[PDB]
Design an enzyme around this catalytic site. Structure first.
Site, PDB file in Angstrom:
ATOM      1  N   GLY A  46       4.320  -1.459  -6.362  1.00 46.26           N
ATOM      2  CA  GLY A  46       3.271  -0.840  -5.578  1.00 46.26           C
ATOM      3  C   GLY A  46       2.104  -1.743  -5.260  1.00 46.26           C
ATOM      4  N   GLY A  66      -5.401   3.043  -1.475  1.00 41.54           N
ATOM      5  CA  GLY A  66      -4.782   3.869  -2.527  1.00 41.54           C
ATOM      6  C   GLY A  66      -4.117   3.275  -3.792  1.00 41.54           C
ATOM      7  N   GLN A  67      -3.261   4.031  -4.467  1.00 40.56           N
ATOM      8  CA  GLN A  67      -2.562   3.591  -5.711  1.00 40.56           C
ATOM      9  C   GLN A  67      -3.386   3.029  -6.931  1.00 40.56           C
ATOM     10  OE1 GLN A  67       1.004   1.528  -4.389  1.00 40.56           O
ATOM     11  NE2 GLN A  67       2.348   3.314  -4.552  1.00 40.56           N
ATOM     12  N   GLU A  68      -4.359   3.807  -7.381  1.00 43.15           N
ATOM     13  CA  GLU A  68      -5.252   3.453  -8.469  1.00 43.15           C
ATOM     14  C   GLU A  68      -4.786   2.714  -9.736  1.00 43.15           C
ATOM     15  OE1 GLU A  68      -7.852   5.927  -7.422  1.00 43.15           O
ATOM     16  OE2 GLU A  68      -9.329   4.368  -7.812  1.00 43.15           O
ATOM     17  N   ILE A  70      -3.244   0.151 -10.153  1.00 42.00           N
ATOM     18  CA  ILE A  70      -3.234  -1.297  -9.985  1.00 42.00           C
ATOM     19  C   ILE A  70      -4.624  -1.857  -9.714  1.00 42.00           C
ATOM     20  CG2 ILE A  70      -0.974  -1.365  -8.910  1.00 42.00           C
ATOM     21  CD1 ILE A  70      -2.580  -1.567  -6.184  1.00 42.00           C
TER      22      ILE A  70
END
Ligand SMILES: Nc1nc2c(ncn2[C@@H]2O[C@H](COP(=O)(O)OP(=O)(O)O)[C@@H](OP(=O)(O)O)[C@H]2O)c(=O)[nH]1
Ligand SMILES: [Mg+2]
Length: 175
Positions: A46, A66-68, A70
């Site tokens: 991701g 997005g995608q917290e 990381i």
């Protein structure tokens, strides 16, 4: 653009992060610079990071949005950064507020204290693109003036327009 990075810096320390929303045009810019061997990394799933290195000029490119999980790893890539290039789709008005929020979440991080900021008002070659002064107001970049050297440069990535100016500007403000 062939080699222009080399004759400009000649292996001074220079660690550049180049970020922005998806579709802004970063990968286009990265490849226009002819910087050398790209290394497409996946530090974790991701999180697609593309790094190039020439003499001593390092690039690291990924998309925000997005995608917290990381983000602690975003901060690992922040440490030691000498310049942030933040690319904006100048022709996508209804995503400008998105792009604004993501810029401020990056540039105000403590690991980016006093970091140089170039905002690329990219795709200026599209009808309806916002002008640099317009983008400055929309993004409230005045809030960063106290602590960050910053500029908004209009670019056309697919032409290379503005990219030489961007590198020269970063270079003039660096050690
Ligand atoms: N008018 C205009 N278009 C640009 C410019 N830069 C990139 N585009 C295009 O916008 C799309 C996004 O490019 P890309 O580098 O993949 O964006 P990203 O890496 O930030 O996600 C590309 O088209 P494709 O994905 O279809 O190949 C690219 O060719 C620009 O300066 N002006
Ligand atoms: Mg890309």
């Amino acid at each position: 653009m062939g080699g222009l990075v080399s004759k400009l810096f000649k292996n001074r320390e220079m660690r550049i992060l180049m970020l922005g929303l998806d579709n802004a045009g970063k990968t286009t810019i990265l490849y226009k610079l002819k910087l050398g061997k790209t290394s497409k990394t996946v530090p974790t799933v991701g999180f697609n990071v593309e790094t190039v290195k020439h003499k001593n000029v390092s690039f690291a490119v990924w998309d925000c949005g997005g995608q917290e999980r990381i983000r602690p790893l975003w901060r690992h890539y922040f440490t030691g950064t000498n310049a942030l290039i933040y690319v904006v789709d100048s022709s996508d008005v209804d995503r400008l507020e998105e792009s604004k929020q993501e810029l401020f979440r990056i540039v105000t991080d403590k690991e980016l204290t006093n970091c140089l900021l170039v905002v690329l008002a990219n795709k200026q070659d599209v009808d309806g693109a916002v002008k640099p002064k317009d983008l400055i107001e929309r993004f409230q970049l005045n809030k960063l003036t106290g602590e960050h050297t910053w500029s908004v440069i209009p670019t056309i990535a697919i032409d290379g327009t503005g990219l030489v100016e961007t590198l020269n500007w970063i270079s003039s403000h660096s050690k």
